[PDB]
Amino acid sequence: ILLKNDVFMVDRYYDYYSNMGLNRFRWKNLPPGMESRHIEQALFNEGQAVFFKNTDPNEPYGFLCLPCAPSNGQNIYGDPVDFNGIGVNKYFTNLSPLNAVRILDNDNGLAPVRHIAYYTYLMSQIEMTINMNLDQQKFPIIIGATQKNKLSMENLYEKYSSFEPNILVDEKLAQALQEGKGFDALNTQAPYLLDKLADFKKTCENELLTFLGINNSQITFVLEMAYKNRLDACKRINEMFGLNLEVEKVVNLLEV
Amino acid sequence: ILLKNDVFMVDRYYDYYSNMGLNRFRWKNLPPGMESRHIEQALFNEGQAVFFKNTDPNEPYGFLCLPCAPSNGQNIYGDPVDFNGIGVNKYFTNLSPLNAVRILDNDNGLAPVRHIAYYTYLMSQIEMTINMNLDQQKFPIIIGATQKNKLSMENLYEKYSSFEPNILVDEKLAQALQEGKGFDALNTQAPYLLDKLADFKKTCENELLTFLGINNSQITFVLEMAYKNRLDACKRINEMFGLNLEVEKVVNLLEV
Amino acid sequence: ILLKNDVFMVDRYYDYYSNMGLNRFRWKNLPPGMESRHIEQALFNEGQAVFFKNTDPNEPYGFLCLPCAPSNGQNIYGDPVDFNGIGVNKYFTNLSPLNAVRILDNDNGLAPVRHIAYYTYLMSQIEMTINMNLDQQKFPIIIGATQKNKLSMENLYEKYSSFEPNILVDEKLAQALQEGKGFDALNTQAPYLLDKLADFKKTCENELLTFLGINNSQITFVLEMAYKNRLDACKRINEMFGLNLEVEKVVNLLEV
């Protein structure tokens, strides 16, 4: 960071809105060595996850919950016939509806990160536009002059000014004989936008929070669909494995 | 995604509004191996569905509910004489009103996806226009100059500016003798639209939710026609097959 | 400081907003020779910290809490396998989840200083723009004249004025025969911005305080995520070492 006319703007918004998106739900009884955050990040980043019993003795886990890639074969309705669990430096070959449970964030399996990635691009472009418009307010007019005229204006300003004048030598103005004034002012005044751009950023933030279900009828309905899909997977895991998982909405982070 | 001057905008809106449209109704008693979502996606995507007893022993189902294509023959009133059930990698030849039930979303069999497909195209064009208008605010004026004049303006800006000036060499300006100033400013200032475009997107969203019946007299009446057609098919299925299906509106996703 | 047309503006804002950011939380029971401020500055500057028992006899400490750099190896979920504690003139090699606790400010480990560094750059540019716009109000018009005309205007002003006129000799105006008036006024009037720039600074301050969780649903939710991560590390330290640490929000600095 700290360069001229740039900032590492993406990270500030991407991580900040990811912290919110990762904290909608909590899973409260789990197999050994597994945390609520692991299920929720697979749902957040891929939109779908697969829960299964481990068989590879090299990995120190009884059960895994990982992002899912379905195989290309399907039944009459279009349900995929087999599931693939993707891990860091690992890949689990064709698990099935007979021996694993596939969990969805929402019924199309659209990942919540895809909303965040569009809006972080947009908020970084609003920031750049704020900064360019602010810098442009420093220069409402520029004066072209002859070299001796330029010198005489710097003396007029050095009397009462705290800056240097916005004046330059124009080579055509200095060269030409006959007509042409020896001073000419070009109006470079940009419109003031800073008030409007801060409002539009706040409008974009509320749109993002609505697509996440976080913020009112559509907001509640978005989070209800997200909760229903988790309740329905939770009873399937309890029925296939006997594990007594439960899942809840986060109305507050701390319990008491 | 992540390319310059483009986004994969269609998916974000198409899947998000499909999740809402697929959750208006719930079917609560069903034959073995069949889910409420299977009936509702055939009604959502085709506007009409056919419910029938399976005869093909290769398929692991007692009853199927699939999108319907009617045959071109009809009675005096214009009711189709036979029905065809369309499956993934499958096609069931001429079923009839004597041995199957055809279900409608609404009396013309207009598919709810046809509303979503128009409005996702429109919302993707509003997004592109927002992004183009935002980028255009960075450039209210451009300056044409001679090559030595351009150099002298870059020194004036490097004193107090955090960016580079919007200045270029004009080859006609640099070439020509006699008159012509050696700096000329062309006004490229676009109108500010971002506030208005965010309002129009919200206006388009409410129109889509009204055509789906989801959002007040017309909204309720749209969902009442949609429910009535399902109740009327539900008693027909119970009368032709003895299955005790029931169907309800989703006022909330979870029951308790 | 005290130079013409500059100020040491960064420090005034950076230290002032750092004092606020360092005072969100308090840690109330601690090992010998360690202070609440030491944990909180490692969380504030790096976003993550490592708590461990000292082994190097040259250092006068039983336990240390320092900014953390993870090693590049990770499990299936992407948790880092080892931790490195970074000190002033010191570096502690690969500590592990078996013998140390890693503390987060927030789940992505985004440092709170990264918000402050962007907004202090912005507030220093608003200040410079205020000062340039104020200086520009002194010069709404400049007059070009012949040398004898300039002298005659200084006598007109010395009668009733408390300043000197904004007048200079124009060498083209003085040189040329025939047409051209012997006085010409160039309009240099800038727009008045000081009222608008003070408003935008206040808008930027509220945005910074929201990203810190300090200032209402998003503000509370930001501080709740920040507290939850500290409570969860606090019980881990008490379980690995038997130290009875506790952590609290600062609703007031003094207790009574």
Author numbering:
A (entry chain B), B (entry chain A), C (entry chain C): 28 to 242, 261 to 301
From the primary publication:
The Portal Protein (PP) complex is a central component of Caudovirales virions in the process of self-assembly of phages. The PP has multiple functions: (1) as a nucleation point for capsid formation; (2) as part of the motor for loading the genome into the capsid; (3) as a head-full sensor; and (4) as a conduit for genome translocation. Both GA1 gp10 and phiCPV4 gp17 PPs have the canonical fold and domain organisation found in the portal protein phi29 gp10.
Guelinviridae infecting Clostridium species also cluster together (in yellow) with the phiCPV4 PP (gp17) sharing 28.7% sequence identity with phi29 gp10. The height and diameter the phiCPV4 gp17 dodecamer are 82 Å and 158Å. In phiCPV4 gp17 the N-terminus could be traced from residue Val23 and forms the α1 helix similar to that of phi29 gp10 and GA1 gp10. In phiCPV4 the inter-monomeric interactions occur between α4 (Asn176B, Met180B, Leu183B, Tyr184B) and β9 (Leu195A, Val196A, Glu198A) of the adjacent subunit. The inter-monomeric interactions are located between β9 and α4 in phiCPV4 gp17, which is different from all other PPs; while in phi29 and GA1 gp10 it is the β8 and β9 from adjacent subunits that make the more typical inter-monomeric interactions.
